[PDB]
Amino acid sequence: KRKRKRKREGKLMSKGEELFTGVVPILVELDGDVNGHKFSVRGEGEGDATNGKLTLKFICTTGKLPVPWPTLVTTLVQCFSRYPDHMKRHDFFKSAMPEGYVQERTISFKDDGTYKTRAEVKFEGDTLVNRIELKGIDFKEDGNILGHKLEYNFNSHNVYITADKQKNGIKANFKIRHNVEDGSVQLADHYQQNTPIGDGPVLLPDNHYLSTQSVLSKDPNEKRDHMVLLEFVTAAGITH
Amino acid sequence: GPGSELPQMVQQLNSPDQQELQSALRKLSQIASGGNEQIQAVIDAGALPALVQLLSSPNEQILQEALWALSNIASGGNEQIQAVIDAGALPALVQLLSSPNEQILQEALWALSNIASGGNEQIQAVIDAGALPALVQLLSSPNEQILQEALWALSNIASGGNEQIQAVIDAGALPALVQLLSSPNEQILQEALWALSNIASGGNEQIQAVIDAGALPALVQLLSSPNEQILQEALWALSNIASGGNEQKQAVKEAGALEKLEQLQSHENEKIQKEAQEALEKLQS
Numbered sequence: 473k474r475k476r477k478r479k480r481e482g483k484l485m486s487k488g489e490e491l492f493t494g495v496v497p498i499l500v501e502l503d504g505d506v507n508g509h510k511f512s513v514r515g516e517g518e519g520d521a522t523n524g525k526l527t528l529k530f531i532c533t534t535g536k537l538p539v540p541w542p543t544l545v546t547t548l549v550q551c552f553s554r555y556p557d558h559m560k561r562h563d564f565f566k567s568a569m570p571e572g573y574v575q576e577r578t579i580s581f582k583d584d585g586t587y588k589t590r591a592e593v594k595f596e597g598d599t600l601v602n603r604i605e606l607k608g609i610d611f612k613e614d615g616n617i618l619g620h621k622l623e624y625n626f627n628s629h630n631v632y633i634t635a636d637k638q639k640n641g642i643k644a645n646f647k648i649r650h651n652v653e654d655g656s657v658q659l660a661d662h663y664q665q666n667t668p669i670g671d672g673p674v675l676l677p678d679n680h681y682l683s684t685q686s687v688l689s690k691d692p693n694e695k696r697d698h699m700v701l702l703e704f705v706t707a708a709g710i711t712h
Numbered sequence: 713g714p715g716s717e718l719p720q721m722v723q724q725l726n727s728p729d730q731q732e733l734q735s736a737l738r739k740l741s742q743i744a745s746g747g748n749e750q751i752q753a754v755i756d757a758g759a760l761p762a763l764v765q766l767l768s769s770p771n772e773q774i775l776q777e778a779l780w781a782l783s784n785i786a787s788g789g790n791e792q793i794q795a796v797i798d799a800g801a802l803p804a805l806v807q808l809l810s811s812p813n814e815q816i817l818q819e820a821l822w823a824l825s826n827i828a829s830g831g832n833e834q835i836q837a838v839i840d841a842g843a844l845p846a847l848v849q850l851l852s853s854p855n856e857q858i859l860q861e862a863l864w865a866l867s868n869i870a871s872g873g874n875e876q877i878q879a880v881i882d883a884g885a886l887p888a889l890v891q892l893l894s895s896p897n898e899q900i901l902q903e904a905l906w907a908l909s910n911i912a913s914g915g916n917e918q919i920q921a922v923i924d925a926g927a928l929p930a931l932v933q934l935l936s937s938p939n940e941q942i943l944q945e946a947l948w949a950l951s952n953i954a955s956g957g958n959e960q961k962q963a964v965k966e967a968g969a970l971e972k973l974e975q976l977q978s979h980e981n982e983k984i985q986k987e988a989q990e991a992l993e994k995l996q997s
Contacts, residue, residue, distance in 0.1 A: 474913035474952050477906055478871035480829035481822050481864055483787040485745055487780045490822055491815070494860045494899055522899075570815055598814070598855050672773065673738055 485560040486675050488569035491595065492521035492551065498528060499601045500548050506608030507585070507618065509538035515548060515701075519600060521566070524554030526703040531696045539608070540622040541699040542650055545686060546579070546662060547589050549602050553682050553705040558712050562677030564633075564642045564666065570595035571670030573641075579648075582659040585611030585618075594669060616650070616658045623651040626686035632709075635676045641667040642677070680709035713746060715739075718757040725762035730771070737766070737774060741781035751788040760785075760799035767804035772813060779808070779819040786826035793830040802827070802841040809846040814855060821850070821861035828868035835872040844869070844883040851888035856897065863892070863903035870910035877914040886911070886925035893930035898939065905934070905945040912952040919956040920963075928953075928967035935972040943984060947976070951991045961995055 484490050500515035517528035530541070530548055537544075551565035565573070572594025579587035591604040611618050631646045648660040668674045687702040724736030744754050754760075759781075766778035782805075786796050796802075801823075808820035824847075828838045843865070850862035870880050885907070892904035912922045927949075934946035950973075954964055973995075976988040 474955050475948065476871045476910055476913050478829055478868050480787055481783075481825035481861065483745065483784055484780065484822070487776055487815070487819065490818060491857065494856045495897060496856070598857070673742075 485563065486567035487672075488566045489560065489563065491569050492519070492566055494522070495520050496552075497599045498526070498549060499596075499599050500528065500530065500604070501601070502544070502548065502604045502606060504539075504606045504608070506539055506587070506606075507611045507613075509618075510534065511538055513537070513544065513548070519549060519552035521552045521554060524552065524703075524705040526552055526701070526705070528701045529691060529694075530699045530701065531694075532698065533696075535697065537697050539617050540620050540650075541624065541688065542622055542626050543579075543581075543587070543617055543660065544606075545626050545688075545701065546648065546660075547577070547587070547591070547604055547606055548701070549593060549600060550666075550682065550705070551593065551600065553707050555707045559680065559707050559710050561675060562680055562707070562710060564635075564675050564677055565593075567673075567675035568666075568668040568670070569600075571668070571672065573669055574665075574667045576665045576667075578663045580661040580663075581611075581615075581617055582661070584615045584658070585609055592669070616652050621652055621654070622658060623653055624688050625651060626688055627651070628683075628685040630681045630683050632679065632681045633677060634679050636665065636667075637676055639665070639667055640674055640676070641665060678710055680707060682707055714750065714753070715743060718743070718753060718759075722757050722759045722762060725759065725766070730774075734774065734777075737777050737781075741777050741784075744781045744784045748788045748792065751785050751792050754781075754785070755792060755795050760795060760801075764799045764801045764804060767801065767808065772816065775816060776819060779816065779823060783819060783823035783826055786823055790830050790834070793827050793834055796827060797834060797837050802837060802843075806841045806843050806846060809843065809850065814858070818857060818861060821847075821858070821865055825861060825865040825868060828865055832872045832876065835869055835876055838869060839876060839879050844879055844885075848883045848885050848888060851885065851892070856900070859892075859900055860903060863900060863907055867903060867907040867910060870907050874914045874918060877911050877918050880907075880911060881918060881921050886921060886927075890925045890927050890930060893927065893934070898942070902941060902945060905942065905949060909945065909949040909952055912949055913955075916956045916960055919953055919960045922953060923960065923963045928963060928969075932967045932969045932972060935969065935976065940981065940984070943976075944987065947973075947984070947987050947991055951987070951994060954991065954995045961997070964995060 495518045498517050498519050502513040504511040511534045513530050515528045515530035519526050555563040575591045577589045587608050589606045593602045634643050636643045644664040646662050650658040683706050685704040689700040721736045721740045727733045763778045769775045786793050805820050811817045847862045847866050853859050895901050937943050973992045
């Protein structure tokens with residue numbers, strides 16, 4: 473006898489969930505101005521929410537980046553987090569698609585400046601786009617950020633997600649520890665708010681966390697100021 | 713989880729005002745997202761004909777919710793897939809494969825992949841609704857997601873009876889399928905291997921149609937794959953194709969898979985070692 477495979481495509485907790493079932497092309501556009509130093513970044517690549525894998529290459533189109541690439545990692549698509557089967561009802565990010573969401577952040581670099589960011593994460597055709605505006609203020613010209621004193625890496629840690637039922641959104645407050653070349657640590661305090669763009673129903677989650685692992689690299693044949701970024705993200709913190 | 717104001721919701725599904733219809737549809741759809749016990753409660757309340765009538769709604773947000781609710785219902789048991797078929801949802805689902813809204817098309821395909829994961833009579837119902845000419849078209853789509861759901865749908869229809877396999881063959885899925893064996897994306901590749909393995913599990917003629925489409929050289933190239941799943945699948949397809957006549961075995965030999973099958977016996981894998989010894993023994997008769 474011969475063997476045959478048949479299987480249902482499955483249950484979907486949201487309509488938007490289905491839009492991340494395969495590999496999805498990503499486009500990232502950033503418009504920066506830190507202490508008056510204007511810059512623009514453009515990233516392209518793909519996201520695979522099935523495995524929680526992002527692969528992107530970011531290029532500074534304005535020339536040399538005034539800030540270190542690791543300070544931009546958090547700003548430069550949480551919809552590509554792998555939500556295990558028992559947690560699919562807690563995926564706000566995919567549920568807000570295709571119309572997308574607004575992501576706002578205040579990043580406070582301890583004893584240095586602050587980044588204010590506003591981004592629109594949504595589908596434009598089959599491409600998931602993250603279009604951002606970042607404004608940086610009160611930075612030390614000889615600090616770890618303007619003086620590029622940070623190592624080219626990004627530490628793996630847990631971001632805790634909480635609901636914002638009154639704003640029909642999501643909130644997250646987490647710290648980032650950037651390694652300084654001398655041996656010290658530069659802390660970056662993240663305060664986040666996500667709100668849907670559309671008027672459709674959204675999946676509001678119970679408290680949980682996102683575990684993320686990042687690898688920063690350089691393309692050998694790339695003469696422009698760039699960053700090749702690899703990420704692995706998984707949702708956890710809610711039991712069966 | 714379980715509500716108790718469901719009959720009033722089905723009555724609100726046929727409301728002349730758009731807002732009280734959308735509220736009833738939103739709450740009723742979330743109930744269908746739950747367990748198989750919850751899917752029964754929505755069927756038993758008679759929500760199905762109202763949701764089917766909503767598949768011809770000129771509002772995209774109503775259409776998208778009706779369609780999402782119905783695909784979750786079809787993700788239930790075989791009698792719940794039947795309830796969807798019986799409610800007449802199939803012709804409306806096949807018409808939605810021509811939607812200019814990609815999200816609605818995707819939602820329609822996923823609903824179809826679910827229905828075609830049911831019994832052979834339910835697979836035939838899909839064929840009769842005429843989904844095959846549309847799914848073969850979607851195989852040329854530049855949209856990776858459309859291509860995945862169309863291959864998942866076709867792979868299910870091809871797990872049916874040999875006349876149902878022939879329905880897929882006569883719809884001309886084979887050239888598009890053999891083209892997809894070279895594809896860079898791992899998932900769509902695993903799916904093309906899935907659909908072809910099912911077509912290759914049919915009668916000797918259907919096994920020959922796969923060979924005639926030029927599947928054999930591509931399949932031999934997948935035996936030298938690093939991915940253990942494509943390796944496993946490339947040989948499932950190779951074993952199924954070997955189950956034919958002496959002409960369906962000699963075609964495999966002529967492709968060059970002989971020396972390739974011999975090496976996969978010294979492989980470190982335990983599942984692939986037993987799959988290889990079960991494959992070459994079938995080829996020597």
